[PDB]
Design a protein around this ligand. Structure first.
Ligand SMILES: CCCCCCCCCCCCCCCCCC(=O)OC[C@H](COP(=O)([O-])OCC(O)COP(=O)([O-])OC[C@@H](COC(=O)CCCCCCCCCCCCCCCCC)OC(=O)CCCCCCCCCCCCCCCCC)OC(=O)CCCCCCCCCCCCCCCCC
Ligand SMILES: CCCCCCCCCCCCCCCCCC(=O)OC[C@H](COP(=O)([O-])OCC[N+](C)(C)C)OC(=O)CCCCCCCCCCCCCCCCC
Ligand SMILES: CCCCCCCCCCCCCCCCCC(=O)OC[C@H](COP(=O)([O-])OCC[N+](C)(C)C)OC(=O)CCCCCCCCCCCCCCCCC
Ligand SMILES: CCCCCCCCCCCCCCCCCC(=O)OC[C@H](COP(=O)(O)OCCN)OC(=O)CCCCCCCCCCCCCCCCC
Ligand SMILES: CCCCCCCCCCCCCCCCCC(=O)OC[C@H](COP(=O)(O)OCCN)OC(=O)CCCCCCCCCCCCCCCCC
Ligand SMILES: CCCCCCCCCCCCCCCCCC(=O)OC[C@H](COP(=O)(O)OCCN)OC(=O)CCCCCCCCCCCCCCCCC
Ligand SMILES: CCCCCCCCCCCCCC(=O)SCCNC(=O)CCNC(=O)[C@@H](O)C(C)(C)COP(=O)(O)O
Ligand SMILES: CCCCCCCCCCC1=C(C)C(=O)C(OC)=C(OC)C1=O
Ligand SMILES: CCCCCCCCCCC1=C(C)C(=O)C(OC)=C(OC)C1=O
Ligand code: SF4
Ligand code: SF4
Ligand code: SF4
Lengths: 82, 114, 176, 185, 55, 115, 156, 318, 43
């Protein structure tokens, strides 16, 4: 929560704890629907894993447009100081 | 073709409501396993919730998925409040039923149903 | 054409105030209730000594079903299925065919006593007084399938209880 | 039975567990007596316990199979466990204090004759001592549950269902996943 | 109705009402269990003339 | 000495009526017969949750009025003294102070229950 | 043998004490419970037989399923029956508790309480009279009278 | 030969409890226009033996959520304190002649509440919790007059000795100078002993069984026989307080027969009140013993302190 | 004809009102009895 690097490493840590994503393909600019091949509900439980990690209620309109871990770490950086 | 909505103007608000309902079920399942003292894992109940959501995944009518969100919130209120019992929650897990014959050959062997 | 229950104002002279204060401090209506209960203590109770004494019944009473016969040995049921057409619970199942002398009789006459609602539409729909709902009510079983009567059980109920069913129909049949 | 009915299906269960068993309930109920005594710390015997609905589906699929006539089936669970960590997993699901201790073979049969002098159903016997401390033999030549189409259920799915009864209220509502599984061999 | 007049008087005093005049246990004052056979009347359409059903 | 024997006897054949109550019949224990009773359906939450006392001010003032019968209780003995008008004045002072306390607890609606 | 005589007389003692101290539970469902109250009424009077209600299942001996068992209450019926200590018995009163009854083909009715609990005495009627219910209770007492618990323990 | 005296005390006052169950059911039946038990024995005289054998051959059912130690200790302490409140009662001679037997009765009344109370807590159930805290609400209501009434009646006795209370009432009954105290003590003992109209702990209609709703047979027997031992002891105690009989030092059986039939009449009076009244709401219980009985009890305490001084009739303490 | 019918003069008059017969003493009599019992006990 202090620097952006810890946030990005923690995002990738939660996404490799997530089991339906194969971590070998998991890059920071990897997409979930067309690259990793996920359902929408997979991305929804990814966002709820992010709320289990970071601890702030993410609305629906700005979590729909979180289609890569880079967008996730950029949105957490927008909602924080860094 | 000019019909009156229930909650959703189109499929975007409808998918928003389906998404919020799946969020609420995903948050609810560990409490449902705990205080009903169900003998299933939390992943197993979450996969049952994913199966019950993917069962209705072919609907393209906003009014029908509005009613599905409505009935899902009703079942969620029956699950948060202890109004269901262990039987009503485990009825989504068809466990006493036999695996029905799937191919043509075993359905031919057991009976007359197509 | 209407009356006001509980619209009494109490009297406020010193006599009635002292009377209610004695009722409050000395518990008069409580002693009234104790007196009425003590009055029932010294009565004869209404307890009939079952199974030696029986509750009173009428000749209209609707109990166990029975298939009746004519006074020659011939059974009365001529397979016309009005009793299962009017049965409000579909307890009666009838299957029939002409028997060996060409007579219209039943091969199956089943009454499910655990669907039966004991309303007696079958005994009032029967044109020949074959099915009746007789006087027996003490026929509790220890297993469920003993309360699924076939034709043989119903004819044995008729042969068992005929000396009473004939008399009850003789007592009531002018009202029917 | 094989010589007087040659077409009989003779079934070998290993050690059946369920709600009404005398296997996991037995392992539970030595928190009453003491500190669950075991021959040679219960680490020289191996068990592979089978679930009861697996055995029941095996019996019914042996009824429906004409190829099960004259066979000899061996119904075992999927995982083999030593007796030590089997009992440790039993006492870990029930959240009881597990403090085992070695009792020798000549003295743990005197405890066996101490409880079979009752005229009722005995709490234990020397035969049960011999059979808790008999290893489940491996017979690969006999067909099993996989040859009747019965998928064998492991202990880590049904042990909570068996052993929720032996818990006290302070840990009565803990879940199936809130325990480390036993070590297989 | 078989009670002694001591118990009868105590019971009347305790209830405050006259109880032998209005007994709740029934005796020979009730109707007979065997009755004469009735002759029930018929309705207004049990006629042989001017009885067209459409009218 | 006799009191200890009598209490030991009462406790003994009150606990020998329990040890022949648990060990004599036949048990069929399963984890639904020992479930909590909530009139047939499963209980919502625990019965160890806070059960809010409505009568709490009366519950506190019972602790201040129960001391009075540790104070008013020597009055059968205090009547046996040789300074008796002083004793009578102090006794009526104690019951009067209890009564003034009860009057004050009435008039501020302290004997009523909350909600 | 002497021991067979002793266990026979002790069977007679425990069967006497269980059939002459039946405590049913305050549990009705439908119209049959009105008639079951009439079996408690001063004419038929269950209490002369030792038959008296206890509201808790822990302190009840028989469950008279008096009325219609629907689907919404069948788990409540099963948990109430489970919370009765052994020996516990079930008397099924009326047609809906026996076999579904007048609501047999309904979407919402359990077709007989014997799909849910083991049933000892089936009392037939819609409703059975309070005298017929008391007949079923006395037949249950006769069923308890011929139990052979300690004899079968002595022989096994 | 004192242990034989303890046994001949406490075994007949278990048989009296047993046949009080039959007397309760039959007097309750004839007051309800029905009969009580008459089938099991000759006119029901063997019904309590069937009930006593039945409850100890039925499965005991210790619950899953129950804190088991207090769950077992509650009926043990119930029947222990029910038996041991009979020992200072003069019959005309008490088992243990205490100089302060009244305070023993009062303190062992105060300890008997914890049987109900720990039974309601230990059996981890919601109705049992309601039945336990309704016992709290009932005990804080009756204890705030149970000691002042019993104080004001002994200001004519001189001590807390129950055996002296026979000598106190040798001329007149002590209900004649103290009938407001008597009619208030009687209701305070109804509310003490959890009998109707003050049931309120084993509430059949509000609760299911209240505190003993989880107690199956065997442990349930030791609350029920405890409650009936409490009511027989409490009517014997009320009889000793207000209806003390003639005592001949050479013929004790005359006094024994006399207080026996008086306490039996008060037991029938308890059964006859339980057969006739609706049940209080358990706050109206508290607004009775605090707002109605307690002011008048303080007034009668002033009067019964001042009146032996007023007439030079202070009783001796010896 | 024969039919279940009321008699020719009809049935008798039927009571249907409240009869709570107002028994007991008055207030002053019961307080006089109570105070007299108090005075006898005190003497
Ligand atoms: C009060 C103390 C008891 C006094 C005796 C008593 O009340 O007797 C009932 C006797 C009759 O009462 P009832 O209710 O009017 O009975 C009318 C029936 O028709 C009378 O009943 P019945 O016509 O059916 O007569 C037959 C009846 C006759 O009844 C008796 O003999 C009564 C029992 C007397 C002993 O005998 C039986 O039913 C057999 C009963 C056997 C067991 C009796 C057990 C009694 C307790 C002793 C143990 O009561 C009175 O006469 C009034 C009380 C007299 C008190 C006198 C002073 C004391
Ligand atoms: C204070 C008043 C009450 C006092 C206590 C009651 C007095 C009478 C005491 C003896 C009663 C008879 C024995 C207890 C009741 C046993 C009930 C029962 O189910 O028994 C079956 C049991 C055996 O049951 P089982 O072995 O058939 O098991 C059936 C249950 N399954 C299969 C599920 C496990 O028998 C006993 O426990 C025998 C008890 C002792 C018998 C008498 C010995 C001599 C006594 C002199
Ligand atoms: C022990 C031997 C037997 C003793 C007698 C008892 C047996 C009869 C029992 C009958 C059944 C009772 C069952 C429980 C009933 C519970 C209800 C109940 O009783 O409520 C109490 C009721 C309550 O009344 P309430 O509830 O209607 O009060 C309404 C209160 N407000 C207005 C605030 C809402 O009465 C009392 O509290 C009175 C207590 C006893 C009074 C005794 C007074 C004696 C006279 C003193 C002197 C008077 C003159 C003044 C001085 C003159 C000087 C010269
Ligand atoms: C000096 C003598 C000794 C006095 C001290 C010893 C007292 C012994 C008794 C102990 C009493 C303790 C509790 C007393 C509480 C009194 C206050 C009270 O309750 O006031 C409220 C009451 C009206 O009640 P309310 O407010 O409507 O309550 C609603 C819920 N019921 O208000 C009322 O009902 C009005 C109360 C005042 C008027 C009473 C008049 C009685 C007169 C009797 C004759 C004279 C006696 C001598 C004393 C002087 C009295 C003025
Ligand atoms: C302080 C006083 C306290 C008093 C406590 C007791 C009060 C009640 C006293 C007893 C009252 C009568 C009891 C009657 C019992 C049954 C009698 C009877 O008829 O039993 C018959 C039964 C079956 O026999 P069967 O062969 O069927 O008979 C066919 C007949 N041609 O055969 C049997 O039942 C077998 C025989 C059993 C006998 C049991 C008798 C009762 C025992 C009660 C215990 C207490 C006894 C007293 C102890 C203290 C005094 C000494
Ligand atoms: C964990 C939960 C609890 C589980 C275990 C429960 C055990 C039973 C609990 C209930 C009994 C508690 C007893 C408490 C002490 C009572 C003392 C007593 O009875 O005193 C009254 C009486 C006064 O008479 P007095 O004026 O002394 O006359 C003789 C002089 N002429 O005194 C006499 O007559 C004197 C006779 C000798 C007295 C000896 C001293 C008292 C012995 C106390 C034993 C232990 C008490 C334990 C209390 C546990 C409370 C829960
Ligand atoms: C423990 C067990 C508890 C069982 C829980 C039962 C839950 C039952 C609730 C069922 C509610 C529904 O099925 S509403 C879903 C129907 N929605 C539709 O037809 C619209 C299409 N929606 C979808 O495809 C959804 O997956 C999304 C996520 C909204 C969009 O994803 P697509 O894009 O990729
Ligand atoms: C104590 C007197 C006998 C009571 C017996 C009650 C047994 C259970 C019957 C169920 C029932 C209850 C409780 C009941 O209160 C009631 O209301 C009148 C009913 O009818 C709708 C019932 O069916
Ligand atoms: C040796 C001691 C024997 C004690 C027997 C206890 C069991 C008897 C309970 C009978 C009973 C009584 C007296 C009773 O008071 C009652 O209330 C009406 C009942 O029904 C709810 C009863 O079942
Ligand atoms: S009595 Fe009614 S329900 Fe029964 S068989 Fe006859 S018609 Fe059918
Ligand atoms: S109505 Fe009568 S004759 Fe006709 S089928 Fe039924 S029983 Fe037979
Ligand atoms: S069997 Fe019939 S009368 Fe009886 S409760 Fe059911 S519906 Fe009512």
């Amino acid at each position: 929560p202090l620097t952006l690097e810890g946030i990005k490493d923690r995002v990738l840590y939660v996404l490799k704890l997530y089991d339906k994503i194969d971590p070998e393909k998991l890059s920071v600019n990897s997409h979930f629907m067309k690259d990793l091949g996920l359902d929408s509900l997979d991305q929804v439980e990814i966002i709820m894993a992010m709320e289990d990690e970071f601890g702030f209620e993410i609305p629906d309109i700005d979590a729909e447009k979180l289609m890569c871990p880079q967008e996730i770490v950029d949105y957490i950086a927008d909602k924080k100081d860094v | 073709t000019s019909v009156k909505p229930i909650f959703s103007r189109d499929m975007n608000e409808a998918k928003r409501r389906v998404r919020e309902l799946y969020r609420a079920w995903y948050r609810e399942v560990p409490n449902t396993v705990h205080l009903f003292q169900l003998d299933i894992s939390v992943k197993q109940g979450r996969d049952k919730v994913r199966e019950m959501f993917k069962k209705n995944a072919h609907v393209t009518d906003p009014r029908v998925v509005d009613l599905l969100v409505i009935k899902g919130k009703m079942e969620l209120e029956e699950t948060i409040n202890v109004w269901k019992q262990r039987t009503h929650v485990m009825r989504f897990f068809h466990e006493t039923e036999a695996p029905r014959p799937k191919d043509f050959l075993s359905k031919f062997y057991v009976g007359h149903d197509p | 054409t209407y009356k006001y229950v509980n619209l009494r104002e109490p009297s406020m002279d010193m006599k009635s105030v002292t009377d209610r204060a004695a009722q409050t401090l000395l518990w008069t209506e409580l002693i009234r209730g104790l007196g009425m209960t003590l009055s029932y203590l010294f009565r004869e109770p209404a307890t009939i000594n079952y199974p030696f004494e029986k509750g009173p019944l009428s000749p209209r009473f609707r109990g166990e079903h029975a298939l009746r016969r004519y006074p020659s040995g011939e059974e009365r049921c001529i397979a016309c299925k009005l009793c299962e057409a009017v049965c409000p619970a579909q307890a009666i199942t009838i299957e029939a065919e002409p028997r060996a002398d060409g007579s219209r009789r039943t091969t199956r006459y089943d009454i499910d006593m655990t669907k039966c609602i004991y309303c007696g539409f079958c005994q009032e729909a029967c044109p020949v007084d074959a099915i009746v709902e007789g006087p027996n009510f003490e026929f509790s079983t220890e297993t469920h399938e003993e309360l699924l009567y076939n034709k043989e059980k119903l004819l044995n109920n008729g042969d068992k209880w005929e000396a009473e069913i004939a008399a009850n129909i003789q007592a009531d049949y002018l009202y029917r | 039975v094989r010589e007087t009915f040659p077409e009989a299906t003779i079934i070998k269960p290993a050690d059946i567990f369920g709600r009404e068993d005398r296997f996991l309930n037995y392992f539970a109920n030595i928190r009453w007596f003491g500190g669950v005594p075991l021959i040679s710390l219960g680490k020289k015997t191996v068990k592979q316990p089978v679930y009861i609905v697996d055995v029941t589906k095996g019996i019914i699929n042996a009824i429906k199979d004409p190829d099960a006539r004259g066979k000899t089936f061996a119904f075992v669970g999927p995982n083999r466990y030593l007796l030590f960590d089997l009992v440790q997993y039993v006492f870990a699901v029930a959240h009881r204090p597990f403090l085992p201790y070695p009792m020798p073979h000549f003295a743990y049969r005197w405890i066996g004759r101490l409880f079979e002098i009752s005229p009722f159903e005995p709490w234990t016997t020397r035969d049960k001592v011999e059979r808790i401390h008999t290893t489940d033999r491996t017979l690969p030549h006999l067909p099993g549950l996989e040859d009747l189409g019965v998928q064998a259920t492991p202990l880590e799915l049904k042990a909570i269902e068996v052993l929720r009864r032996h818990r006290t209220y302070r840990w009565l509502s803990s879940e199936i996943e809130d325990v480390q599984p036993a070590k297989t061999v | 109705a078989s009670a002694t007049r001591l118990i009868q008087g105590l019971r009347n005093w305790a209830s405050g009402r006259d109880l032998q005049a209005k007994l709740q246990l029934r005796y020979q004052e009730i109707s007979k269990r065997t009755q004469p056979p009735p002759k029930l009347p018929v309705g207004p359409s049990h006629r042989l003339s001017n009885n067209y059903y459409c009218a | 000495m006799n009191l200890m024997i009598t209490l030991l006897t009462n406790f003994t054949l009150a606990t020998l009526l329990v040890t022949i109550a648990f060990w004599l019949p036949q048990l069929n224990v399963y984890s639904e017969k020992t479930s909590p009773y909530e009139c047939g359906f499963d209980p919502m939450g625990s019965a160890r949750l806070p059960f809010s006392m409505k009568f709490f001010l009366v519950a506190i003032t019972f602790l201040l009025f129960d001391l009075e019968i540790a104070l008013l209780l020597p009055l059968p003995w205090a009547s046996q003294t040789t300074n008796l008008n002083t004793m009578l004045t102090m006794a009526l002072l104690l019951i009067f102070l209890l009564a003034v306390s009860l009057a004050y607890e009435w008039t501020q609606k302290g004997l009523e229950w909350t909600e | 043998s002497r021991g067979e005589y002793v266990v026979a007389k002790l069977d007679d003692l425990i069967n006497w004490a269980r059939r002459s101290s039946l405590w049913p539970m305050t549990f009705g469902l439908a119209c049959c419970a009105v008639e079951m109250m009439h079996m408690a009424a001063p004419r038929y009077d269950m209490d002369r037989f030792g038959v008296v209600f206890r509201a808790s299942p822990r302190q009840s001996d028989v469950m008279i399923v008096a009325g219609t068992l629907t689907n919404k209450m069948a788990p409540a019926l099963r948990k109430v029956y489970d919370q009765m200590p052994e020996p516990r018995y079930v008397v099924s009163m009326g047609s809906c508790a026996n076999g579904g009854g007048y609501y047999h083909y309904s979407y919402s009715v359990v077709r007989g309480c014997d799909r849910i609990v083991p049933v000892d005495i089936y009392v037939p009627g819609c409703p059975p009279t309070a005298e017929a219910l008391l007949y079923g209770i006395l037949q249950l007492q006769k069923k308890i009278k011929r139990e052979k618990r300690l004899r079968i323990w002595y022989r096994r | 030969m004192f242990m034989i005296n303890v046994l001949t005390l406490i075994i007949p006052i278990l048989l009296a409890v047993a046949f009080l169950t039959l007397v309760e059911r039959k007097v309750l039946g004839y007051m309800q226009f029905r009969k009580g038990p008459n089938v099991v024995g000759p006119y029901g005289l063997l019904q309590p033996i069937a009930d006593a054998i039945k409850l100890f051959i039925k499965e005991p059912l210790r619950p899953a959520t129950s804190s088991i130690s207090m769950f077992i200790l509650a009926p043990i302490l119930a029947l222990t304190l029910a038996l041991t409140m009979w020992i200072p009662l003069p019959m005309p001679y008490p088992l243990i002649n205490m100089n302060l037997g009244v305070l023993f009765m009062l303190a062992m009344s105060s300890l008997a509440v914890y049987s109900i109370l720990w039974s309601g807590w230990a059996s981890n159930s919601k109705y049992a919790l309601i039945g336990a805290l309704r016992a709290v609400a009932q005990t804080i209501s009756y204890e705030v007059t149970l000691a002042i009434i019993l104080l004001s009646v002994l200001l004519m006795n001189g001590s807390f000795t129950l055996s002296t209370l026979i000598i106190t009432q040798e001329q007149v009954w002590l209900i004649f100078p103290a009938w407001p105290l008597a009619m208030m003590w009687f209701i305070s003992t109804l509310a003490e002993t959890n009998r109707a109209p003050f049931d309120l702990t084993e509430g059949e209609s509000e609760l299911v069984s209240g505190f003993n709703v989880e107690y199956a047979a065997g442990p349930f027997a030791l609350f029920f026989m405890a409650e009936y031992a409490n009511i027989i002891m409490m009517n014997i105690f009320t009889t000793t307080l207000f209806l003390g009989a003639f005592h001949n030092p050479y013929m004790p059986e005359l006094y024994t027969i006399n207080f026996t039939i008086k306490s039996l009449l008060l037991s029938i009076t308890f059964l006859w009140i339980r057969a006739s009244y609706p049940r209080f709401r358990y706050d109206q219980l508290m607004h009775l013993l605090w707002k109605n009985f307690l002011p008048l009890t303080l007034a009668l305490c002033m009067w019964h302190v001042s009146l032996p001084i007023l007439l030079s009739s202070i009783p001796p303490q010896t | 004809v024969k039919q279940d019918m009321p008699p020719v003069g009809g049935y008798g008059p039927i009571d249907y009102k409240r009869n709570l017969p107002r028994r007991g003493l008055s207030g002053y009599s019961m307080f006089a009895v109570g105070i007299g019992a108090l005075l006898f006990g005190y003497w």
